Structures are given as C-alpha cells and as structure tokens.
Amino acid sequence: PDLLQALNPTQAQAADHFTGPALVIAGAGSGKTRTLIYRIAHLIGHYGVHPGEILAVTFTNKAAAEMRERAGHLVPGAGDLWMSTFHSAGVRILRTYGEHIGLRRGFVIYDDDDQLDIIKEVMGSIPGETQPRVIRGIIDRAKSNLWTPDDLDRSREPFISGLPRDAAAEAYRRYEVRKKGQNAIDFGDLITETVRLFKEVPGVLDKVQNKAKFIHVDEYQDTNRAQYELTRLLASRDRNLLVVGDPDQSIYKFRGADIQNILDFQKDYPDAKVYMLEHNYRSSARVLEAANKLIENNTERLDKTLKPVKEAGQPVTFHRATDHRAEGDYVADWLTRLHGEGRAWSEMAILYRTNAQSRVIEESLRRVQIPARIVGGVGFYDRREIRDILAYARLALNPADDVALRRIIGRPRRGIGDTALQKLMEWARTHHTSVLTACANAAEQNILDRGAHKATEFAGLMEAMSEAADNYEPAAFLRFVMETSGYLDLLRQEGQEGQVRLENLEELVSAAEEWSQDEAGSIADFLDDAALLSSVDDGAPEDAVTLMTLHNAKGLEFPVVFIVGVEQGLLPSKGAIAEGPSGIEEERRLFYVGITRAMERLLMTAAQNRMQFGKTNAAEDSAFLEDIEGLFDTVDPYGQPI
Amino acid sequence: PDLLQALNPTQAQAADHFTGPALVIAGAGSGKTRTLIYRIAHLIGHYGVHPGEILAVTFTNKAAAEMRERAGHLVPGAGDLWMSTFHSAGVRILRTYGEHIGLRRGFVIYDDDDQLDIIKEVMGSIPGIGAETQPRVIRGIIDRAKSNLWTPDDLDRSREPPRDAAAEAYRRYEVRKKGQNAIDFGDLITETVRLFKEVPGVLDKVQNKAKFIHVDEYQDTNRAQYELTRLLASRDRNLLVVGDPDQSIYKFRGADIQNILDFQKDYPDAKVYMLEHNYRSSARVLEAANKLIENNTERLDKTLKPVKEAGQPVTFHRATDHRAEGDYVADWLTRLHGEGRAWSEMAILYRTNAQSRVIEESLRRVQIPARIVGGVGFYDRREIRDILAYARLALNPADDVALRRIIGRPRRGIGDTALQKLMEWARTHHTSVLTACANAHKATEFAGLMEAMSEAADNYEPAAFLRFVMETSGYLDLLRQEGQEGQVRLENLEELVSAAEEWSQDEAIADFLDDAALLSSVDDMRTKAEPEDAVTLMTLHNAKGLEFPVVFIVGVEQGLLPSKGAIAEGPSGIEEERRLFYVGITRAMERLLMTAAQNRMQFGKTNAAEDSAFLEDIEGLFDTVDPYGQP
DNA sequence: GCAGTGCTCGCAGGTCGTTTTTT
DNA sequence: ACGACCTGCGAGCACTGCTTTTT
Ligand SMILES: Nc1ncnc2c1ncn2[C@@H]1O[C@H](COP(=O)(O)OP(=O)(O)NP(=O)(O)O)[C@@H](O)[C@H]1O
Ligand SMILES: [Mg+2]
Ligand SMILES: [Mg+2]
Ligand SMILES: [Mg+2]
C-alpha cells in the first residue's frame, strides 16, 4: 500500500490524511474513487485504524457496490467495513434502534409508489382534486430540508408549490399520522427519522459513533439539509470527517440538494485540511478546455480547475439542424459512420435535457437499424415486477401490510373487485382490523355473494406463504411466492408479450441465492436491501448506443458523446430562466457535466425548429454556446467546418 | 224495451225499480248482469231519464262497452251513457278536473313495477332491513291500506306488527310519490274519495252525470270503493248494486265479503230483490256447482234451480304430467271444434298465469288459434314500455323512475357515476330529476331532446308524436344496430303506432297513457294490441262475469287449485279458493272438462301433484275420463 | 405529443326467487 | 327454465397539462 506507488502525488496526500476533518475536491476524471479506497487501506494498514470504525457513504448503490468490491481486493478484513447509502445506513440504524423512537418490529419502509397510495387517502377532506404526486414531492422536499408540517405552513410565502401553506401542510400533516399508524417510514424518513433518533437519544448516537470513528461522504455537493445534519451528528464526537465533492456538479437542487453545504464546509470546520484533485485522466484536452471555459462563468464557487493529461484530442463540433427530426437523422448518420470507423455501440451515448427528446432520436436510430438502450425515465428500472413480488413477501411477513395488499390484489386477478375490496376495507376500518384479516373473515361475518370465498382463498394462500417465510430460505421463498401467487402466469401472458419481466424476476431469485452466499441473515434482511435497489444492482454491456438525460449521465463516461437540443428554453431551461442567475448557474453545471463525460469526442446539436407537446416553434440557440464560442467548430450535416 | 217478455217476473220487477237504493242478490248465471242491462234500457225508455245521467261501475271497461251496445240494441242513446270501472272513472273524476285538492296538470300513474322502484328506493333507510329486503312485501301493505282508506298515522296506531317502519316506509314512499307528481292506483280512488269529502261542492257537480248509480260484481268490492259509492250516492239515493256472495274471490285485495252484505245495514230503503234460477248452465254443471258451494258453511243461503235440461256429463281427466294435460286439452279442443263447435266458444281456466305457458304449446303444435288474457303485457314488453317512459317523462319532468329506464337503452353517454352525482343533485336540491340533469354535456343533449319532446308534444298528434320520440330517441337506431332478434322488437314498436291509429278513430294523448296504465286484463287496448274465432285462456279470477259453452279447468290440484297460500291460511282461505272453484264451474254453459296432472314442473323441478281436495266434495258429480273419454 | 387517468358502456360468469290470483 | 341482478374485468374515448431523480 505505497501511496506514492499507487497514486498521483496530490492523491497520495489526500489518502495520507488521518484525523480531524478534510475536504477533498474531485473534479471529473480525477480518480477520486481509487484515491479514497487506498486512503481507507492506508488508514487501516499504516495508521492502524480499525475497519469497524470506518464508515464510507455514497449516494447510489452502483457507487457503494464499486466501493465494496474494490476495497475487498485491496484491504484485509474488508468485510468489517460499513459502506452504504445514506438510505442503506439509515435502514441499518433504524432496524437496530428504532424502538427508541417508537418504531415496532418489524416496521415497513414505503417506497415512492406506496407513498402515493397513502397520499390519495389523506387527500379526501383537505381544501386542496388535481394530482397526488405533486404532494408526494412536496413532502419529500419537506423531509429533505428537515421541515415539519408545522414549520412548512410557517413558510413566509404561501404558494411555493401550488396550494396554500396550510392546504399543502395539512396533507403532509395527515400523511404523517396515517403513515405512522400503519407502522411505517418512507425513504426520506430513513435519513430524517435517524437524525431525530440521534437528537433525542444521544446515548444511541455514541454506540453508533464507535462504528463511525472515520467517515467519507461522497458527492457532498448533492447532499441536502437533512443529510447534512445527519453527517454532522455522526461526526460531532471525533470530527474525523472527510467529504469528497465537486461544487460545479451539484445538479440536484430541485431534489433540494444544498451546494452551500460543501461551500460552507471549510467555514463549518475551520481546522479542516483541504486537498484538490484537478487532474483529469478521463478526457481530451479540447473537451476539458471547452468545459473549463464554460464553467468559469458560474459565480464565486471554489477555485479549482481541470488539468489536462491527454493530448488535445479531436475537435468539438456543433451541428445545427432545421429539424428536430433532422438532428435525430444527423445523429444516426454519425453513429453509423463511427461504428464503421471501427467504434462499438457501447462506446457512444446521446444526452438530452428531457426524456421526451429520446423519441425522435430513438425512432431515427430504429430506421438505420442501430441498437438502442434508453436509460429509462418513462419506464421503471426493473421496478414494477420486482416490487410486486415484495408486496407478497411483505404481506406474508406481516398480514397488516395493507398497502402491500392493495397492490398485489390486482395482480393476478383473484376476482376481488371495487365492491368486495371496499366492503372489506369499510368493515376493517370499522373494527380496527387488517384488510387481509377482513378477507379471512368474509364468510364468517357477512360479506354477501359467494365472492367471500375468493376473499377467503386469498387469505388462505397468503397465510400459506407466511408459514413458508418462517420455514424457508430467501431464494426458495420467492419460488414459493412466485408459483403460488400466479404472478408468473399472468406475467407469462404479458411474458409471451414481454418475457423479460419474467427474466429479471428469475434474476432476482438468483440474486437471492447470492445473498446467502456472503456471510450472514433473515428474510426480512434481504428485502431491506431489495427495497432500495432500483435497477437490480449486483451481465456484460448490451452493445447498444445509450440514451439518457444529462442528470442521468453523472458519474459515467463515454468515448463518444452526443449532446443534443442544446438550446434556450431547453438546456438553460425556461423554468430555470425564470429563477434568474442562480438558476442559470445550475443549468450551466448541468451542461458542464455532459461535457466532462465525453472522453474522446463530443458532438453537439440543436435544432432551428423543435416541436414540444404538439405544434412547432422557432428554437432559439443555447446561451452556453456563447460561453464556449471559439472552443468548438460549427458544422454542416457532414463533418465540415463551414 | 218490453221487460216482461224478455225477463223473468222476479227480474222484470227488479229491473223495474226506479228510485233509492236497491239490492239484487243471486247465484251465478241468474241474470243479475242481464237484468242490470235492462234496467238501463227502462229508465231511458220508460222513466224518461237522460242516459247522460247514469253510470254503471264494473271491473273491466269491456264489461262496460259490451254492456253499452246492449242498451243501444234496446234504446238508441247508448252514446250518452257512462260506464267504466272505479279506476277508469275514479281516474276520470280526478283527472278531468283536479282543479282542487292541490294536484298539478300533467301528473302520471304508477303501475305495479313503477311502485316498486320507489319501494326498492326508500327501503334501506328505515329499520326493517334484513329478510324484509324482499321489496314486494311492502307495496302490498302500502296497498291494502289505501283500500281501507288508511293513512300512515293510523297505520302507526295498531295492535300487532315493524310498525312505525311500515308506516314510515309509506310516509316516505308518498312524500316521494308526491315528488314525482304521480298517483298509485288506490289513490285513484282514495284521492277520488278524499276530493269529494274535501270539497262537497265539487262532488255534487258529478252527481249530475251520475243521476242513477249502477254497481255490478259488488260480490268483491273494497272499502275505498265502498265509501266512493256511499259518497257518490248520498245526494239523492239512486243506487242499484248487484252481486253474489258465493262469488266473492277478491279477499286478498281487501274486497270484504261482509263489505257487500252490510249494504243492508248501510241503507234502509234498499229493496232486496232475490234470484233463484240459473239460465246459464246445464243441470249437471249446476248440480256440481251447487253441490260444491254448500261446503262454505255459514255463507248466506241462496239456491240455484236449473232452467236448462241436464246435459253432457261433467268430466275429469288426470294426466301423467303437465304436457299430457296440455296435449289432452289440445286433443279435445280439436274434437269439439270438429263437432262444429267454434273456437270462440271455448275457454281454458287456470289458477296461475304461469300455467298458460305449457297449454299454449299444445295449441301451437296442432295450430289451434288462441288468445291469452293478462299474462305478458304487450304493454309490459321492453320495446313499448320504455317509449311510454319517454312519453311519461316527456310530459312530466318529475318522473325519475322513468328517467332511469330510458337513459340507458338509447346509450346517450350517460354515467353510472353521473347518475349518482345527479341523484345527489336531486337529494341536495330537493329537485325533480330532469331539471338536475338539464343543468358532461350529455345533460344539454338529453335536455334539448327532452325539452323538445314535451315542447313538440302539443304541436304533434299521438300517432306521429310517438314516431317523433322513437326517431329522436334513436331507440330506432339501437334496435337497427342490434336487430336480428330485435326486428320482432320494432314490429311491436310499429304495432304501437297502429294501436294509436285505432285510438285515433274513437274520441275516447297523455290520456292514451292513462288508458294503458288502467287497462284491465280483458280491456281492448290490451287485447288487440297483444283471428276473432280463437280459444281463450285466462285465470279463474279473470273468468268472473263471462260464460263459455265449453270450459276447461286445468290444474285442479292441492297447492294449486286451493293454492299453497290458501292452505297455509287454513279454513278462511279454503272457503275462498273453494268459492274460486265454484266461480270456475259456473262459467260453463254446455260442456265442462276438468284436468289435473300426476306430476307438474315448476322452477325446472318436476314434482308430484295430487287432486284438489275439492274434487272430493263433488264425489259422484263427475265422470272420470281416460285420455280418450272412456273411464 | 404523449401519458396517466376518468369513466363509460359492454362480455362474462355466478346468485337467486319467481307462481296465488288484478287495476 | 328462465330474466333479473350483481360483480368483475377490460377495450374504449376524450380530457388536460407537463424539467430534471436517486434511494
Ligand atoms: N230471463 C232470462 N231470459 C233469457 N236468458 C237469460 C235470462 N236470465 C239470464 N239469462 C242468460 O243466462 C246467462 C246468465 O246471465 P248473466 O246476467 O250473465 O248471469 P249473472 O246472474 O250475471 N251471473 P255471473 O256470471 O255471476 O255474473 C246469460 O246468457 C243470460 O243472457
Ligand atoms: Mg407494485
Ligand atoms: Mg253478471
Ligand atoms: Mg306489470
């Protein structure tokens, strides 16, 4: 583990950091992940720290996964390290200490779908018909800022989201209480409740801080008030906290992420040491230059840059097309050309501000028989068929999971319907009972028709499943739940239609077998992770061109990148245009992220005209193109300078 | 009219009766009806009375009409006559001028089905919720009362009951009937009764058109009617009622055996006229009839002497099953018709409408003409009824009961959920339904269609008015879109035009519907609409006051001739059914045949049956016939 | 432009009670 | 045996209103 052998000099210094706090600024391509793992390896090896004591924190599972494998190769006793998501940590903490704040065994975690359920119910009598999601987001940003239904409606300005302080705040008020009644927490709770647990019960904070003596928090620019608070609490005792971020890459301010957190970090921790990694290995010099010039525009953020390390590669180009249709045609003309130049589909990707944009693009590649992968924004990431099965699992684990019940009741159809269902629910509400136990007593207590049995059968097979969970392995249990539920059969028709949703379900079952390989482990446990998995994180690249939003692009890189619809009111989104400068800066950060993702060549497009939501209008051109004028060549349809 | 030459002395004086209450009382086929007919011809011809000045009230307008031509045969002046049922008149009383009592021009009548739609409606609300969910039970108790003139308050005050439940159900049912501005049958009377007593000034005005008052088939007559009568009369007592106690089969409907008899106590002046001779039946028939009836002990004592020589024997045949019973009647109808008997002169009498289904089949195979009475209204059939709903609701906005049946069939875009949102609009505003609908733009489409129909009601004649609705409703289009089987459905709807044109010859609009609602089973609207030489099928009940040379009585069995209902009830029910049987035999003139099966099917289950207890009564007053007549 | 949802209006399959009469 | 009834389910229509998303 010789840091000077392993790493860059500036890296080695950051990896050499030991106690007290440090800020690590990592621009793109900076080999931050490597650096940070060795530091972990150094801390244990060189400074004789304990793995028990080290906590690494990231935002995504991919990240945490990469973190854990890499560590394993390099660090002995890697098993004993706590690397996970803010959420995954939150789960772990609350599963172990929930009872101190009134969470019973075994409470449930509501995913984003499940929230809506509740929301629709609580809406019934509030001043505010419309849409329920809206409200879901209102809550989510509220819980993210660490806001309470009370101090929400104490908000100076009454219409931050449509509806008055109280009309908004009431929904959140009601949503809270019912949620709690059901014995459950949403995804933000895992952070916000955990904060509250620490704050109330400090003695609990300690028992934890013995497991988190040293702390890495990645992407500290995306961090939010609530995540901020939690981190401070964890680190408050020993101040051994190293947060790696990049201020020019906060692109989730709508998620309520606070760029100020990382800016204020050396103000928050006056003693902290600073380290800056400005070296970009990933990208071309011409790319980086474009990127660096673009970015210096954002006002008064931390003084840093992208040090080139590859020769100034191929030029950056910017074609404009009359047609938003033409640009899609234009894009395919090129992916062909380059696939012919000797360059694989995997090597190339297309980035768009909004998902809508994928269709014209997609349809264009589809005409020149060009493989396409769309990092789905319209369609769930393996989510619908996975979360269903869990609904069975989660209802089998406790029969009072009425949210789980409402969802799997439709799949497959049991011949239970709006009438039966609501009857069973009216009765249940009226006697303080689980909808499912209502099912179980349909025949015993007067629910007319001989549907009763369709209700009694469901309870019967649910409870069959419950016995199984007690007496089976995780993998076998999903084989049981799958075949008995008949999700396979209904999905076999929709499977004959699809067949894939059947496959990653088999893949899920496989991953369940992998769960029991690693040491340690309750069924309840496997499910705790699965609930957070979006996209079934654990098969090699598809060999397609990739399509994704710029937001989606973050932390990924491609030899070839296409950035499309680089126009005013698209990029530099009109919405953000209303926000004034503060908003424009955020957009600029977004544009910046794309550029930094391109390794060898970057093509840019906009249209003369574009259609959105019906009609066709004159497309303006992106002001950020000004910001980088001269650092790119404009072009006709074929690659000609003009 | 020369009474003495045309009537028996006892009859000739009875008909001669000229003022004040009088009562004729006789056994069946005695001329009570016939003498009632001559009475009319007399007062016109002899006692110089305006025919405009008399009414005879019955239990079918055909009883009346065939009754009309009769005075015409006797005295010209059959035009100015007034003859109808209580209802046909008790409706005309109210309807012609209801310019008092508080009602509104354009009201509607609620038939049995109409009734239930409100009883199914206001039923959930009040505590009789469980096995009294059965809806029919309530409309009965709602109807038996309006027959005794009872209100909800005095229904609340009763011995043994669900009591305030019953009365409230009625209380609501009414304030909801009130709402739709429609009137249950009873009302027809009751409101008639009420009105007279409400305004003693208005009633006199009628007693000018009712100078002398005839009542036939007083046998059965409810207390609502009794008071109507008692009232209609009182100005100057000029009432004759005629009837037979042994022929009182309308108990279930509140017609009081005793209601009839106490007429003497009610009226002092009443001159009781008695009749002893039977003109209608062969002696072997009457002997059986007389032999039977004697079993209703503590009934009155009349007697029936034959005027006719004893005849062909009364015969009885038991068959293997209900088919073999229908096929037998078919076979025999064929034979008799062969002897030169005409279909017109034969009839089959059963206890329950259901029994007609099978008999017909036997008749169809052979290709014998038949006409059924009061089984499956042409005016019942979907095709017709819904357009009558268009008609009801066209004129009367408030008819939600109808609104229901018409909005759906012509698929107008209209929401099951829109309904419950609009019925809430009714419930919130306390509004007539259509108005809530009038003011999701199908509401504007229905309103301009509906508004039109009623606005185009007064400019258009009924015959072409119905073709206005039928086309504009699109009810045509729906029938043409799904009309392979539906073609018979528009054929009825074409027939509905023709029957309007039949109506167009006579001077008899909304009026039309009245008739349709009030139609007796034997009334003409119901008959022609639903060859003239045809066999006639009807219920023993309907048989009342008619006669047939040849009569079949099918299904003379326990649980059926007596009826399960009557048996369960014990004696008072038996004597009633028995009296029903006596009514059966008494329609025959020459030939009576009786049948039962050994096994009858109902509800898909073929079940053993046994001969009526009644056959036992007439031990050797009938021969027992194998399928072919022998033994 | 498309999607996510409202609500219609109809196959489809099972329960049930309907027969004691009439206006 | 039959006609009404009631659910259940799912293919249709036209309604409208919206930037971006991780666990
Ligand atoms: N005096 C008579 N002269 C000739 N025919 C008569 C005489 N009285 C009755 N009839 C006939 O015998 C039958 C019985 O007459 P009708 O007046 O219908 O009997 P009813 O006493 O009214 N009994 P019901 O059948 O109970 O109504 C009819 O055909 C009459 O025309
Ligand atoms: Mg689900
Ligand atoms: Mg008579
Ligand atoms: Mg009817």
Side-chain angles (χ1 to χ4, degrees), chain B residues 32-34 216-217 280 545:
Chain B
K32 319 153 190 75
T33 275
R34 165 167 223 273
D216 198 344
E217 276 302 340
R280 175 191 297 166

Side-chain angles (χ1 to χ4, degrees), chain B residues 394-415:
Chain B
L395 308 163
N396 190 233
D399 197 337
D400 59 9
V401 173
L403 190 139
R404 312 291 307 262
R405 303 279 182 154
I406 37 87
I407 193 52
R409 276 173 202 79
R411 279 299 172 207
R412 250 193 225 67
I414 271 298

Side-chain angles (χ1 to χ4, degrees), chain B residues 515-593:
Chain B
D515 299 48
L518 292 191
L519 289 177
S520 319
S521 323
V522 312
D523 287 351
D524 271 10
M525 306 253 302
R526 183 87 171 271
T527 57
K528 191 79 156 208
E530 305 200 330
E532 293 310 315
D533 190 25
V535 175
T536 320
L537 285 62
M538 64 184 94
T539 203
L540 284 147
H541 285 70
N542 267 311
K544 196 181 76 168
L546 300 147
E547 54 193 6
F548 288 97
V550 174
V551 155
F552 279 93
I553 298 186
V554 299
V556 193
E557 322 167 3
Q558 287 290 93
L560 205 38
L561 177 63
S563 94
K564 291 103 188 154
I567 302 165
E569 195 185 336
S572 311
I574 295 313
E575 291 188 341
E576 174 82 344
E577 295 313 332
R578 177 165 281 138
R579 184 201 280 102
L580 187 70
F581 195 24
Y582 164 92
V583 174
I585 312 174
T586 319
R587 338 304 318 144
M589 299 179 147
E590 318 272 71
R591 183 57 197 181
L592 168 73
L593 300 91

Side-chain angles (χ1 to χ4, degrees), chain A residues 111 113-114 383-385 387-389 391 407-408 411:
Chain A
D111 68 32
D113 285 356
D114 290 347
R383 288 201 266 242
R384 180 202 133 96
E385 65 285 359
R387 293 191 169 169
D388 286 344
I389 299 296
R407 307 338 300 149
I408 61 169
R411 309 144 190 106

Side-chain angles (χ1 to χ4, degrees), chain B residues 120 357 382 405 441 601-604:
Chain B
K120 281 130 73 187
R357 295 199 39 66
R382 292 178 189 78
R405 303 279 182 154
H441 55 279
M601 149 178 284
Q602 67 144 18
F603 310 157

